[PDB]
């Protein structure tokens, strides 16, 4: 190109990348009740985690799409509805839980011929910026005489979860595969942090291995080029 507008941050970061596949087979052990809940984890996938770990505090809007298909790539005439449960409302546990009755979520009637719907949620986190690791004591008291399990815990930081279920009284007779594509639109940098060099071992803690490695050792000697 010649114009510098094509080479801006919007085109640099605008890319719908795979985040995960939702496994809802005809029969199985993981979700035999005909529905599943997927928590939105940005640290779960390595490359998007490596992208977001360059910064700490930021502000963006979230748009979600549910691409569902069979393992053979064909579509079936089954009625499906995508409903999001707010964090305040508890996650549904049974097929007949009252969490399915949230009135705040409008519904749209379409068919699989219509391409997947687009849903957008703004930044509704109680804090001003994202924080996955919480340094400090969640308890705001002087209690330090017991076993403080709260160190690193944050029962307030959940952003909610998605509830995709088979609409209807009859069980679905088709196996399905669901794919979800994510990208960030509005990016701003507030507090820079060094970009990670050593591989993480766990997602919920910053712990590392006892045997550190070197990024590269191709250069045998400084003399040779």
Partner 1 sequence: TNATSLMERLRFPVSAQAGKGELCAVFRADPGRSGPWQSTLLGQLCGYYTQWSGSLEVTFMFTGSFMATGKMLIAYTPPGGPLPKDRATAMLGTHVIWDFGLQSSVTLVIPWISNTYTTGLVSIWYQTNYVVPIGAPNTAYIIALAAAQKNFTMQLCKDASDIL
Partner 2 sequence: LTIGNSTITTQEAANIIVGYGEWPSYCSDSDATRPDVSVNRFYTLDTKLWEKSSKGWYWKFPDVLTETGVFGQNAQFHYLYRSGFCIHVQCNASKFHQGALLVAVLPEYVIGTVAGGTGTEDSHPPYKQTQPGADGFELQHPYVLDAGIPISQLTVCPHQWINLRTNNCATIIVPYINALPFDSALNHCNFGLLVVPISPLDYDQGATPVIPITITLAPMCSEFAGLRQ
Say how far residue 110 (Cα) sits from the centre of its chain.
Answer: 26
Segment near partner 1 (CB under 8 A), from 85-93, 101-109, 147-155, 207-215?
207-215
CA–CA dist 40, 42 (Å, integer): 7
3-state SS class at 136: coil
What is the phi-psi region of residue 48: left when phi exceeds 0, alpha when psi lies from -120 to 50, beta otherwise?
A: alpha
Give the position of tokens 């005489």: 145
Which residue, 195, 178, 189, 181, is CA-closest to 15? 181
Asked whether the beta carbons of 162 and 84 are under 8 A apart, the reply is yes
If the CB atoms of residues 48 and 176 are measured against a copy of itself, the closer one turns out to be 176
3 near partner 1 (CB under 8 A): no
Residue 48 has what DSSP assignment?
A: H
* Binding mask of the shown chain, residues 116 to 155, with x at each position contacting a copy of itself by CB under 8 A: ----------------------------------------
Q: Which of a copy of itself, partner 1, partner 2, none binds 12 (CB below 5-8 Å, type-dependent)?
A: partner 1
Tokens of residue 58, six digits: 């930021």
Q: Which of partner 1, partner 2, a copy of itself, none binds 11 (CB below 5-8 Å, type-dependent)?
A: partner 1
222 near partner 1 (CB under 8 A): yes
Q: Which of partner 1, a copy of itself, partner 2, none binds 33 (CB below 5-8 Å, type-dependent)?
A: none
Rounded to the nearest 5°, which phi and psi values hold at 21?
A: -115, 135
Residue 6 Cβ vs a copy of itself, minimum distance, rounded to whole Å: 16
Asked whether the beta carbons of 9 and 54 are under 8 A apart, the reply is no
30 near partner 1 (CB under 8 A): no
188 near partner 2 (CB under 8 A): no
If the CB atoms of residues 52 and 69 are measured against partner 1, the closer one turns out to be 52
- What residues line the site for partner 1 (CB under 8 A)? 1, 7, 11-12, 15, 17, 46-47, 50, 195, 197, 199, 211-212, 214-219, 222-223, 225
């Amino acid at each position: 190109s010649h114009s510098t507008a094509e080479t801006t941050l919007d085109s640099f970061f605008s890319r719908a990348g795979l985040v995960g596949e939702i496994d809802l087979p005809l029969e199985g052990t993981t979700n035999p009740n005909g529905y599943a809940n997927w928590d939105i984890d940005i640290t779960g996938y390595a490359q998007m985690r490596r992208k977001v770990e360059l910064f700490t505090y930021m502000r963006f809007d979230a748009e979600f799409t549910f691409v569902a298909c069979t393992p053979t790539g064909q579509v079936v005439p089954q009625l499906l509805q995508y409903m999001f449960v707010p964090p305040g409302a508890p996650e549904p546990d049974s097929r007949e839980s009252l969490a399915w009755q949230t009135a705040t979520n409008p519904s749209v009637f379409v068919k699989l011929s219509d391409p997947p719907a687009q849903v957008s949620v703004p930044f509704m986190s109680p804090a001003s910026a994202y924080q996955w690791f919480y340094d400090g004591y969640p308890t705001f008291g002087e209690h330090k005489q017991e076993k403080d399990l709260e160190y690193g815990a944050c029962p307030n930081n959940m952003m909610g979860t998605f509830s995709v279920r088979t609409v209807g009284t009859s069980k679905s007779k088709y196996p399905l595969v669901i794919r979800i594509y994510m990208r960030m639109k509005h990016v701003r940098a507030w507090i820079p942090r060094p970009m990670r060099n050593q591989n993480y071992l766990f997602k919920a803690n910053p712990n590392y291995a006892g045997n550190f490695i070197k990024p590269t050792g191709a250069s045998r000697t400084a003399i040779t080029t």
